[PDB]
Structures are given as C-alpha cells and as structure tokens.
Amino acid sequence: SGIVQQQNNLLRAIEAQQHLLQLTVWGIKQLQARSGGRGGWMEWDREINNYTSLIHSLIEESQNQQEK
Amino acid sequence: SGIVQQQNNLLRAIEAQQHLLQLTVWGIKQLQARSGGRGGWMEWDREINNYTSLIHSLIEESQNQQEK
Amino acid sequence: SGIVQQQNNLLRAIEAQQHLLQLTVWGIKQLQARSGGRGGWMEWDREINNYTSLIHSLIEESQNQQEK
C-alpha cells in the first residue's frame, strides 16, 4: 500500500493512449486500402490485434485488481 | 508511500510515448493531405485532440501531484 | 514498498504499446517510401529513434531496478 492516485492517473493515460493508437492504425489501414486490398498485411494486422488484445486484458486485470 | 522511481520511470515513458504518437499522427496526416484536403477527418482530428489533451493533463496532474 | 503487480501490469502494457507503435511507424514509413525515397524525413526518423531509444532504456532500468 502506497500511492494509488498516481497509479490510476498513469493507467488512465495508457488507456487513452490505447485509443489514440487504434485511431492511428485505422488511419494507416485506410491509406493502405487506397492502393488495392490489404491482403499482404495479415501478419501486420494479426500482430496489431495480438498486442492490443494483450494490452486491453492487461488494463482490465489492473483495474479490477488493486482494490485494497 | 512506496516505490517512486519506478513510477517516475514509467511516467517518463508515457510522456516520451506521447511524443512518439504525435509524430506518427503528423506522418499520417501529411500522407492524407497528399490526396486533397483532410476535411473528411475532422472527427478523426477532434478525436485525436480529445485524447491527447486528456493525456497531457493526466500527465501534468501526475507530476505536480505526488511530492510527499 | 506497496503495490507491485499493478506496477508490473502497467509496465507490461507500456512495453506492448511500444511494440504496437513500432509497427505503426513501419506501416507509415513504407507508405511514404511508395512515393520515392524517404530522404526528407531524416529528422522525423531521428526523432523516432531518439524517443524509442529513451523508452526502451527507461523500461529496462525499470525492470532490473525494483527487486525489493
């Protein structure tokens, strides 16, 4: 036990930052789509989903797990 | 009270990460501008500003509020 | 001493987020390369390397420095 608001203000930033990134990925994807299909990036897309999924879960296990 | 350097090293990362993102958003924006105007993304731009603004403020309220 | 798992779950997010960003930067770079060379962005590239390098090091000094 020690310092919790600073930990919640930091977590609240990561989350917001997570949203920011998802907007960029979208902006990037759409620009790619401009050429013709984004079939060459499955591994890029899958890589994105992989980490985003790990982060969302990392955030959720951090919010519901700290109440002391 | 407990562990502060690790909290400052993490905050210092979010901040730096904030800068990284703003460079990407710029890189993305300019590439969009290449076609012809970015008038269709106001909501995208506004969404960006919205979170970036929440994060900057979240960071500042975290720096000046922890001195114990 | 106080709260460590929440600090490790947050650090684990920044790291994963670091990877996410590096994928976006790549996606952005390649799209730029499409036109013809990315020689005008050295300062953009150098700016990226600069912060990414500060973040990696900030993360590493945070992992090996907290064992209490």
PDB file of all heavy atoms in Angstrom, chain C residues 3-38:
ATOM      1  N   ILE C   3       2.206  -2.181  -3.443  1.00  0.00           N
ATOM      2  CA  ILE C   3       1.645  -2.387  -4.777  1.00  0.00           C
ATOM      3  C   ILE C   3       2.751  -2.595  -5.809  1.00  0.00           C
ATOM      4  O   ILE C   3       3.471  -1.658  -6.162  1.00  0.00           O
ATOM      5  CB  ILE C   3       0.774  -1.187  -5.216  1.00  0.00           C
ATOM      6  CG1 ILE C   3      -0.265  -0.870  -4.137  1.00  0.00           C
ATOM      7  CG2 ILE C   3       0.075  -1.508  -6.526  1.00  0.00           C
ATOM      8  CD1 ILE C   3      -0.248   0.570  -3.683  1.00  0.00           C
ATOM      9  N   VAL C   4       2.880  -3.825  -6.295  1.00  0.00           N
ATOM     10  CA  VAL C   4       3.909  -4.146  -7.275  1.00  0.00           C
ATOM     11  C   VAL C   4       3.356  -4.822  -8.528  1.00  0.00           C
ATOM     12  O   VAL C   4       3.883  -4.631  -9.623  1.00  0.00           O
ATOM     13  CB  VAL C   4       4.985  -5.058  -6.662  1.00  0.00           C
ATOM     14  CG1 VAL C   4       5.893  -4.250  -5.754  1.00  0.00           C
ATOM     15  CG2 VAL C   4       4.325  -6.191  -5.894  1.00  0.00           C
ATOM     16  N   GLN C   5       2.302  -5.616  -8.370  1.00  0.00           N
ATOM     17  CA  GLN C   5       1.705  -6.305  -9.508  1.00  0.00           C
ATOM     18  C   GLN C   5       1.069  -5.300 -10.455  1.00  0.00           C
ATOM     19  O   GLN C   5       1.168  -5.436 -11.674  1.00  0.00           O
ATOM     20  CB  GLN C   5       0.648  -7.306  -9.036  1.00  0.00           C
ATOM     21  CG  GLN C   5       0.048  -8.153 -10.152  1.00  0.00           C
ATOM     22  CD  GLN C   5       1.102  -8.769 -11.056  1.00  0.00           C
ATOM     23  OE1 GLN C   5       0.889  -8.922 -12.260  1.00  0.00           O
ATOM     24  NE2 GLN C   5       2.245  -9.125 -10.479  1.00  0.00           N
ATOM     25  N   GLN C   6       0.415  -4.293  -9.881  1.00  0.00           N
ATOM     26  CA  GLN C   6      -0.239  -3.249 -10.664  1.00  0.00           C
ATOM     27  C   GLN C   6       0.811  -2.436 -11.418  1.00  0.00           C
ATOM     28  O   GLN C   6       0.541  -1.891 -12.489  1.00  0.00           O
ATOM     29  CB  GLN C   6      -1.059  -2.336  -9.741  1.00  0.00           C
ATOM     30  CG  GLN C   6      -1.283  -0.924 -10.273  1.00  0.00           C
ATOM     31  CD  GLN C   6      -2.502  -0.818 -11.175  1.00  0.00           C
ATOM     32  OE1 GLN C   6      -2.597  -1.506 -12.191  1.00  0.00           O
ATOM     33  NE2 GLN C   6      -3.439   0.049 -10.804  1.00  0.00           N
ATOM     34  N   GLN C   7       2.009  -2.362 -10.850  1.00  0.00           N
ATOM     35  CA  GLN C   7       3.105  -1.625 -11.464  1.00  0.00           C
ATOM     36  C   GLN C   7       3.740  -2.453 -12.575  1.00  0.00           C
ATOM     37  O   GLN C   7       4.282  -1.907 -13.534  1.00  0.00           O
ATOM     38  CB  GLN C   7       4.164  -1.285 -10.413  1.00  0.00           C
ATOM     39  CG  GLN C   7       4.274   0.196 -10.097  1.00  0.00           C
ATOM     40  CD  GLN C   7       5.205   0.472  -8.934  1.00  0.00           C
ATOM     41  OE1 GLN C   7       5.871   1.506  -8.892  1.00  0.00           O
ATOM     42  NE2 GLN C   7       5.254  -0.451  -7.981  1.00  0.00           N
ATOM     43  N   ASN C   8       3.671  -3.773 -12.435  1.00  0.00           N
ATOM     44  CA  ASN C   8       4.236  -4.684 -13.423  1.00  0.00           C
ATOM     45  C   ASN C   8       3.253  -4.881 -14.575  1.00  0.00           C
ATOM     46  O   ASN C   8       3.652  -5.141 -15.711  1.00  0.00           O
ATOM     47  CB  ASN C   8       4.564  -6.031 -12.763  1.00  0.00           C
ATOM     48  CG  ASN C   8       4.352  -7.210 -13.696  1.00  0.00           C
ATOM     49  OD1 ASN C   8       3.221  -7.529 -14.073  1.00  0.00           O
ATOM     50  ND2 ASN C   8       5.442  -7.871 -14.067  1.00  0.00           N
ATOM     51  N   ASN C   9       1.965  -4.756 -14.272  1.00  0.00           N
ATOM     52  CA  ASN C   9       0.928  -4.909 -15.282  1.00  0.00           C
ATOM     53  C   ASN C   9       0.860  -3.653 -16.138  1.00  0.00           C
ATOM     54  O   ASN C   9       0.445  -3.704 -17.295  1.00  0.00           O
ATOM     55  CB  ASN C   9      -0.425  -5.160 -14.618  1.00  0.00           C
ATOM     56  CG  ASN C   9      -0.604  -6.604 -14.193  1.00  0.00           C
ATOM     57  OD1 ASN C   9       0.287  -7.433 -14.382  1.00  0.00           O
ATOM     58  ND2 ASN C   9      -1.758  -6.911 -13.614  1.00  0.00           N
ATOM     59  N   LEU C  10       1.271  -2.529 -15.557  1.00  0.00           N
ATOM     60  CA  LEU C  10       1.278  -1.245 -16.257  1.00  0.00           C
ATOM     61  C   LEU C  10       2.526  -1.162 -17.142  1.00  0.00           C
ATOM     62  O   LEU C  10       2.475  -0.680 -18.278  1.00  0.00           O
ATOM     63  CB  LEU C  10       1.277  -0.092 -15.243  1.00  0.00           C
ATOM     64  CG  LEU C  10      -0.053   0.597 -14.905  1.00  0.00           C
ATOM     65  CD1 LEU C  10      -1.144  -0.435 -14.674  1.00  0.00           C
ATOM     66  CD2 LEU C  10       0.123   1.453 -13.662  1.00  0.00           C
ATOM     67  N   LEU C  11       3.647  -1.638 -16.611  1.00  0.00           N
ATOM     68  CA  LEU C  11       4.905  -1.630 -17.344  1.00  0.00           C
ATOM     69  C   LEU C  11       4.775  -2.581 -18.526  1.00  0.00           C
ATOM     70  O   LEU C  11       5.240  -2.286 -19.627  1.00  0.00           O
ATOM     71  CB  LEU C  11       6.059  -2.072 -16.429  1.00  0.00           C
ATOM     72  CG  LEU C  11       7.460  -2.199 -17.044  1.00  0.00           C
ATOM     73  CD1 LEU C  11       8.013  -0.825 -17.386  1.00  0.00           C
ATOM     74  CD2 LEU C  11       8.380  -2.908 -16.073  1.00  0.00           C
ATOM     75  N   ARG C  12       4.134  -3.722 -18.290  1.00  0.00           N
ATOM     76  CA  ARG C  12       3.932  -4.720 -19.334  1.00  0.00           C
ATOM     77  C   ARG C  12       3.056  -4.168 -20.456  1.00  0.00           C
ATOM     78  O   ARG C  12       3.086  -4.668 -21.577  1.00  0.00           O
ATOM     79  CB  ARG C  12       3.281  -5.976 -18.750  1.00  0.00           C
ATOM     80  CG  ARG C  12       4.266  -6.974 -18.163  1.00  0.00           C
ATOM     81  CD  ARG C  12       3.983  -8.387 -18.653  1.00  0.00           C
ATOM     82  NE  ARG C  12       2.674  -8.873 -18.219  1.00  0.00           N
ATOM     83  CZ  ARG C  12       1.916  -9.715 -18.917  1.00  0.00           C
ATOM     84  NH1 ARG C  12       2.331 -10.172 -20.091  1.00  0.00           N
ATOM     85  NH2 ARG C  12       0.740 -10.101 -18.440  1.00  0.00           N
ATOM     86  N   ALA C  13       2.272  -3.138 -20.148  1.00  0.00           N
ATOM     87  CA  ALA C  13       1.402  -2.520 -21.141  1.00  0.00           C
ATOM     88  C   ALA C  13       2.209  -1.532 -21.971  1.00  0.00           C
ATOM     89  O   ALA C  13       2.113  -1.511 -23.195  1.00  0.00           O
ATOM     90  CB  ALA C  13       0.239  -1.807 -20.458  1.00  0.00           C
ATOM     91  N   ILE C  14       3.011  -0.714 -21.298  1.00  0.00           N
ATOM     92  CA  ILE C  14       3.837   0.260 -21.994  1.00  0.00           C
ATOM     93  C   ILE C  14       4.696  -0.457 -23.031  1.00  0.00           C
ATOM     94  O   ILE C  14       4.779  -0.036 -24.185  1.00  0.00           O
ATOM     95  CB  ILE C  14       4.751   1.016 -21.005  1.00  0.00           C
ATOM     96  CG1 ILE C  14       3.957   2.135 -20.322  1.00  0.00           C
ATOM     97  CG2 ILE C  14       5.959   1.583 -21.738  1.00  0.00           C
ATOM     98  CD1 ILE C  14       4.788   3.033 -19.423  1.00  0.00           C
ATOM     99  N   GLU C  15       5.326  -1.547 -22.601  1.00  0.00           N
ATOM    100  CA  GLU C  15       6.186  -2.366 -23.453  1.00  0.00           C
ATOM    101  C   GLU C  15       5.426  -2.833 -24.688  1.00  0.00           C
ATOM    102  O   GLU C  15       5.849  -2.599 -25.819  1.00  0.00           O
ATOM    103  CB  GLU C  15       6.668  -3.582 -22.666  1.00  0.00           C
ATOM    104  CG  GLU C  15       8.147  -3.867 -22.775  1.00  0.00           C
ATOM    105  CD  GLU C  15       8.470  -5.307 -22.440  1.00  0.00           C
ATOM    106  OE1 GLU C  15       8.114  -5.752 -21.325  1.00  0.00           O
ATOM    107  OE2 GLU C  15       9.073  -5.995 -23.293  1.00  0.00           O
ATOM    108  N   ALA C  16       4.303  -3.505 -24.461  1.00  0.00           N
ATOM    109  CA  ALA C  16       3.474  -3.995 -25.551  1.00  0.00           C
ATOM    110  C   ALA C  16       3.081  -2.819 -26.429  1.00  0.00           C
ATOM    111  O   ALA C  16       3.049  -2.934 -27.658  1.00  0.00           O
ATOM    112  CB  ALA C  16       2.227  -4.673 -25.001  1.00  0.00           C
ATOM    113  N   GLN C  17       2.784  -1.686 -25.796  1.00  0.00           N
ATOM    114  CA  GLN C  17       2.392  -0.489 -26.529  1.00  0.00           C
ATOM    115  C   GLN C  17       3.561   0.011 -27.360  1.00  0.00           C
ATOM    116  O   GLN C  17       3.384   0.568 -28.443  1.00  0.00           O
ATOM    117  CB  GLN C  17       1.921   0.600 -25.563  1.00  0.00           C
ATOM    118  CG  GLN C  17       0.404   0.736 -25.508  1.00  0.00           C
ATOM    119  CD  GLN C  17      -0.057   1.835 -24.576  1.00  0.00           C
ATOM    120  OE1 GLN C  17      -0.948   1.630 -23.755  1.00  0.00           O
ATOM    121  NE2 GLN C  17       0.547   3.014 -24.701  1.00  0.00           N
ATOM    122  N   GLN C  18       4.766  -0.200 -26.850  1.00  0.00           N
ATOM    123  CA  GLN C  18       5.958   0.211 -27.562  1.00  0.00           C
ATOM    124  C   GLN C  18       6.035  -0.579 -28.865  1.00  0.00           C
ATOM    125  O   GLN C  18       6.378  -0.037 -29.912  1.00  0.00           O
ATOM    126  CB  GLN C  18       7.197  -0.065 -26.711  1.00  0.00           C
ATOM    127  CG  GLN C  18       8.432   0.704 -27.132  1.00  0.00           C
ATOM    128  CD  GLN C  18       8.105   2.079 -27.660  1.00  0.00           C
ATOM    129  OE1 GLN C  18       7.229   2.768 -27.130  1.00  0.00           O
ATOM    130  NE2 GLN C  18       8.807   2.490 -28.712  1.00  0.00           N
ATOM    131  N   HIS C  19       5.707  -1.864 -28.793  1.00  0.00           N
ATOM    132  CA  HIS C  19       5.750  -2.714 -29.976  1.00  0.00           C
ATOM    133  C   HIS C  19       4.716  -2.247 -30.984  1.00  0.00           C
ATOM    134  O   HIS C  19       5.004  -2.130 -32.175  1.00  0.00           O
ATOM    135  CB  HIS C  19       5.496  -4.173 -29.590  1.00  0.00           C
ATOM    136  CG  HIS C  19       6.467  -4.706 -28.583  1.00  0.00           C
ATOM    137  ND1 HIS C  19       7.419  -3.914 -27.975  1.00  0.00           N
ATOM    138  CD2 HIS C  19       6.631  -5.950 -28.072  1.00  0.00           C
ATOM    139  CE1 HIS C  19       8.127  -4.648 -27.135  1.00  0.00           C
ATOM    140  NE2 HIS C  19       7.670  -5.887 -27.175  1.00  0.00           N
ATOM    141  N   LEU C  20       3.511  -1.978 -30.495  1.00  0.00           N
ATOM    142  CA  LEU C  20       2.413  -1.510 -31.334  1.00  0.00           C
ATOM    143  C   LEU C  20       2.842  -0.303 -32.161  1.00  0.00           C
ATOM    144  O   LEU C  20       2.622  -0.247 -33.375  1.00  0.00           O
ATOM    145  CB  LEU C  20       1.228  -1.117 -30.453  1.00  0.00           C
ATOM    146  CG  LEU C  20      -0.162  -1.681 -30.740  1.00  0.00           C
ATOM    147  CD1 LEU C  20      -0.093  -2.927 -31.615  1.00  0.00           C
ATOM    148  CD2 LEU C  20      -0.821  -1.986 -29.407  1.00  0.00           C
ATOM    149  N   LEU C  21       3.456   0.663 -31.486  1.00  0.00           N
ATOM    150  CA  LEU C  21       3.914   1.886 -32.126  1.00  0.00           C
ATOM    151  C   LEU C  21       4.951   1.622 -33.215  1.00  0.00           C
ATOM    152  O   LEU C  21       4.897   2.208 -34.299  1.00  0.00           O
ATOM    153  CB  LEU C  21       4.496   2.829 -31.070  1.00  0.00           C
ATOM    154  CG  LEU C  21       3.478   3.676 -30.297  1.00  0.00           C
ATOM    155  CD1 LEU C  21       4.020   4.000 -28.917  1.00  0.00           C
ATOM    156  CD2 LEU C  21       3.186   4.959 -31.062  1.00  0.00           C
ATOM    157  N   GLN C  22       5.892   0.731 -32.934  1.00  0.00           N
ATOM    158  CA  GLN C  22       6.936   0.428 -33.900  1.00  0.00           C
ATOM    159  C   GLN C  22       6.368  -0.190 -35.171  1.00  0.00           C
ATOM    160  O   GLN C  22       6.964  -0.077 -36.243  1.00  0.00           O
ATOM    161  CB  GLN C  22       7.981  -0.490 -33.266  1.00  0.00           C
ATOM    162  CG  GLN C  22       9.202   0.268 -32.743  1.00  0.00           C
ATOM    163  CD  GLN C  22       9.782  -0.334 -31.476  1.00  0.00           C
ATOM    164  OE1 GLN C  22      10.150  -1.510 -31.443  1.00  0.00           O
ATOM    165  NE2 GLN C  22       9.870   0.472 -30.425  1.00  0.00           N
ATOM    166  N   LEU C  23       5.208  -0.830 -35.049  1.00  0.00           N
ATOM    167  CA  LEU C  23       4.553  -1.457 -36.195  1.00  0.00           C
ATOM    168  C   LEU C  23       3.877  -0.375 -37.007  1.00  0.00           C
ATOM    169  O   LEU C  23       3.846  -0.433 -38.236  1.00  0.00           O
ATOM    170  CB  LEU C  23       3.512  -2.479 -35.730  1.00  0.00           C
ATOM    171  CG  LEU C  23       4.053  -3.896 -35.523  1.00  0.00           C
ATOM    172  CD1 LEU C  23       2.960  -4.786 -34.960  1.00  0.00           C
ATOM    173  CD2 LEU C  23       4.560  -4.449 -36.847  1.00  0.00           C
ATOM    174  N   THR C  24       3.334   0.620 -36.314  1.00  0.00           N
ATOM    175  CA  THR C  24       2.668   1.723 -36.990  1.00  0.00           C
ATOM    176  C   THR C  24       3.703   2.551 -37.740  1.00  0.00           C
ATOM    177  O   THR C  24       3.504   2.886 -38.907  1.00  0.00           O
ATOM    178  CB  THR C  24       1.919   2.630 -35.992  1.00  0.00           C
ATOM    179  OG1 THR C  24       2.741   2.872 -34.849  1.00  0.00           O
ATOM    180  CG2 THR C  24       0.629   1.966 -35.536  1.00  0.00           C
ATOM    181  N   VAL C  25       4.812   2.867 -37.073  1.00  0.00           N
ATOM    182  CA  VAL C  25       5.876   3.650 -37.696  1.00  0.00           C
ATOM    183  C   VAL C  25       6.334   2.960 -38.976  1.00  0.00           C
ATOM    184  O   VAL C  25       6.613   3.618 -39.977  1.00  0.00           O
ATOM    185  CB  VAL C  25       7.098   3.813 -36.755  1.00  0.00           C
ATOM    186  CG1 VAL C  25       8.270   4.428 -37.522  1.00  0.00           C
ATOM    187  CG2 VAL C  25       6.732   4.689 -35.556  1.00  0.00           C
ATOM    188  N   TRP C  26       6.414   1.633 -38.936  1.00  0.00           N
ATOM    189  CA  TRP C  26       6.826   0.859 -40.102  1.00  0.00           C
ATOM    190  C   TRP C  26       5.774   1.013 -41.178  1.00  0.00           C
ATOM    191  O   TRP C  26       6.097   1.274 -42.332  1.00  0.00           O
ATOM    192  CB  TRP C  26       6.971  -0.631 -39.763  1.00  0.00           C
ATOM    193  CG  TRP C  26       7.288  -1.491 -40.968  1.00  0.00           C
ATOM    194  CD1 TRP C  26       8.532  -1.781 -41.464  1.00  0.00           C
ATOM    195  CD2 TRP C  26       6.349  -2.127 -41.851  1.00  0.00           C
ATOM    196  NE1 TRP C  26       8.424  -2.549 -42.597  1.00  0.00           N
ATOM    197  CE2 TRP C  26       7.097  -2.776 -42.859  1.00  0.00           C
ATOM    198  CE3 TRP C  26       4.950  -2.208 -41.890  1.00  0.00           C
ATOM    199  CZ2 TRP C  26       6.490  -3.499 -43.897  1.00  0.00           C
ATOM    200  CZ3 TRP C  26       4.345  -2.930 -42.927  1.00  0.00           C
ATOM    201  CH2 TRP C  26       5.116  -3.563 -43.912  1.00  0.00           C
ATOM    202  N   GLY C  27       4.514   0.837 -40.793  1.00  0.00           N
ATOM    203  CA  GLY C  27       3.428   0.962 -41.743  1.00  0.00           C
ATOM    204  C   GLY C  27       3.416   2.332 -42.391  1.00  0.00           C
ATOM    205  O   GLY C  27       3.135   2.467 -43.583  1.00  0.00           O
ATOM    206  N   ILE C  28       3.729   3.353 -41.602  1.00  0.00           N
ATOM    207  CA  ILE C  28       3.763   4.719 -42.098  1.00  0.00           C
ATOM    208  C   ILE C  28       4.949   4.906 -43.040  1.00  0.00           C
ATOM    209  O   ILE C  28       4.802   5.432 -44.146  1.00  0.00           O
ATOM    210  CB  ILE C  28       3.879   5.739 -40.929  1.00  0.00           C
ATOM    211  CG1 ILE C  28       2.602   5.707 -40.079  1.00  0.00           C
ATOM    212  CG2 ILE C  28       4.120   7.153 -41.477  1.00  0.00           C
ATOM    213  CD1 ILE C  28       2.651   6.606 -38.865  1.00  0.00           C
ATOM    214  N   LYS C  29       6.124   4.472 -42.597  1.00  0.00           N
ATOM    215  CA  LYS C  29       7.333   4.603 -43.399  1.00  0.00           C
ATOM    216  C   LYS C  29       7.160   3.997 -44.784  1.00  0.00           C
ATOM    217  O   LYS C  29       7.380   4.657 -45.795  1.00  0.00           O
ATOM    218  CB  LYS C  29       8.512   3.937 -42.692  1.00  0.00           C
ATOM    219  CG  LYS C  29       9.408   4.916 -41.960  1.00  0.00           C
ATOM    220  CD  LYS C  29       9.898   4.352 -40.649  1.00  0.00           C
ATOM    221  CE  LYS C  29      11.373   4.630 -40.460  1.00  0.00           C
ATOM    222  NZ  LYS C  29      11.733   4.728 -39.021  1.00  0.00           N
ATOM    223  N   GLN C  30       6.754   2.738 -44.826  1.00  0.00           N
ATOM    224  CA  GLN C  30       6.561   2.048 -46.093  1.00  0.00           C
ATOM    225  C   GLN C  30       5.625   2.794 -47.040  1.00  0.00           C
ATOM    226  O   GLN C  30       5.864   2.838 -48.242  1.00  0.00           O
ATOM    227  CB  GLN C  30       6.028   0.646 -45.830  1.00  0.00           C
ATOM    228  CG  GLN C  30       5.381  -0.004 -47.021  1.00  0.00           C
ATOM    229  CD  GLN C  30       4.669  -1.263 -46.627  1.00  0.00           C
ATOM    230  OE1 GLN C  30       4.691  -2.260 -47.349  1.00  0.00           O
ATOM    231  NE2 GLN C  30       4.034  -1.234 -45.463  1.00  0.00           N
ATOM    232  N   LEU C  31       4.560   3.373 -46.497  1.00  0.00           N
ATOM    233  CA  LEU C  31       3.598   4.118 -47.305  1.00  0.00           C
ATOM    234  C   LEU C  31       4.261   5.356 -47.895  1.00  0.00           C
ATOM    235  O   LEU C  31       3.907   5.799 -48.988  1.00  0.00           O
ATOM    236  CB  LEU C  31       2.401   4.548 -46.452  1.00  0.00           C
ATOM    237  CG  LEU C  31       1.195   3.607 -46.378  1.00  0.00           C
ATOM    238  CD1 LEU C  31       0.125   4.222 -45.474  1.00  0.00           C
ATOM    239  CD2 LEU C  31       0.647   3.369 -47.777  1.00  0.00           C
ATOM    240  N   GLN C  32       5.212   5.922 -47.157  1.00  0.00           N
ATOM    241  CA  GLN C  32       5.935   7.106 -47.610  1.00  0.00           C
ATOM    242  C   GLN C  32       6.859   6.677 -48.736  1.00  0.00           C
ATOM    243  O   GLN C  32       6.923   7.305 -49.790  1.00  0.00           O
ATOM    244  CB  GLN C  32       6.777   7.691 -46.473  1.00  0.00           C
ATOM    245  CG  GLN C  32       5.985   8.248 -45.307  1.00  0.00           C
ATOM    246  CD  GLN C  32       6.865   8.543 -44.105  1.00  0.00           C
ATOM    247  OE1 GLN C  32       6.537   9.391 -43.273  1.00  0.00           O
ATOM    248  NE2 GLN C  32       7.994   7.843 -44.010  1.00  0.00           N
ATOM    249  N   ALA C  33       7.577   5.588 -48.493  1.00  0.00           N
ATOM    250  CA  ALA C  33       8.505   5.046 -49.462  1.00  0.00           C
ATOM    251  C   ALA C  33       7.829   4.857 -50.809  1.00  0.00           C
ATOM    252  O   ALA C  33       8.483   4.906 -51.850  1.00  0.00           O
ATOM    253  CB  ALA C  33       9.046   3.719 -48.966  1.00  0.00           C
ATOM    254  N   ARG C  34       6.518   4.651 -50.789  1.00  0.00           N
ATOM    255  CA  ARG C  34       5.771   4.432 -52.021  1.00  0.00           C
ATOM    256  C   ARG C  34       5.985   5.538 -53.049  1.00  0.00           C
ATOM    257  O   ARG C  34       6.116   5.266 -54.244  1.00  0.00           O
ATOM    258  CB  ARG C  34       4.279   4.284 -51.715  1.00  0.00           C
ATOM    259  CG  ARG C  34       3.779   2.845 -51.773  1.00  0.00           C
ATOM    260  CD  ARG C  34       4.207   2.062 -50.544  1.00  0.00           C
ATOM    261  NE  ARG C  34       4.443   0.650 -50.838  1.00  0.00           N
ATOM    262  CZ  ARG C  34       5.546  -0.012 -50.496  1.00  0.00           C
ATOM    263  NH1 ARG C  34       6.521   0.607 -49.845  1.00  0.00           N
ATOM    264  NH2 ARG C  34       5.669  -1.297 -50.801  1.00  0.00           N
ATOM    265  N   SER C  35       6.028   6.783 -52.589  1.00  0.00           N
ATOM    266  CA  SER C  35       6.226   7.903 -53.499  1.00  0.00           C
ATOM    267  C   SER C  35       7.611   7.838 -54.144  1.00  0.00           C
ATOM    268  O   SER C  35       7.733   7.650 -55.355  1.00  0.00           O
ATOM    269  CB  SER C  35       6.036   9.235 -52.759  1.00  0.00           C
ATOM    270  OG  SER C  35       7.268   9.789 -52.333  1.00  0.00           O
ATOM    271  N   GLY C  36       8.652   7.980 -53.333  1.00  0.00           N
ATOM    272  CA  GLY C  36      10.001   7.932 -53.864  1.00  0.00           C
ATOM    273  C   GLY C  36      11.050   8.401 -52.876  1.00  0.00           C
ATOM    274  O   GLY C  36      11.381   9.586 -52.823  1.00  0.00           O
ATOM    275  N   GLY C  37      11.577   7.466 -52.094  1.00  0.00           N
ATOM    276  CA  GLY C  37      12.593   7.805 -51.116  1.00  0.00           C
ATOM    277  C   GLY C  37      12.016   8.538 -49.922  1.00  0.00           C
ATOM    278  O   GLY C  37      11.028   9.262 -50.044  1.00  0.00           O
ATOM    279  N   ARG C  38      12.634   8.342 -48.764  1.00  0.00           N
ATOM    280  CA  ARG C  38      12.190   8.988 -47.539  1.00  0.00           C
ATOM    281  C   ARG C  38      13.338   9.834 -47.003  1.00  0.00           C
ATOM    282  O   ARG C  38      13.592   9.870 -45.800  1.00  0.00           O
ATOM    283  CB  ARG C  38      11.784   7.938 -46.498  1.00  0.00           C
ATOM    284  CG  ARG C  38      10.750   6.938 -46.988  1.00  0.00           C
ATOM    285  CD  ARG C  38      11.399   5.741 -47.685  1.00  0.00           C
ATOM    286  NE  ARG C  38      12.859   5.749 -47.585  1.00  0.00           N
ATOM    287  CZ  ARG C  38      13.624   4.659 -47.597  1.00  0.00           C
ATOM    288  NH1 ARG C  38      13.077   3.455 -47.708  1.00  0.00           N
ATOM    289  NH2 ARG C  38      14.941   4.773 -47.493  1.00  0.00           N
TER     290      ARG C  38
END
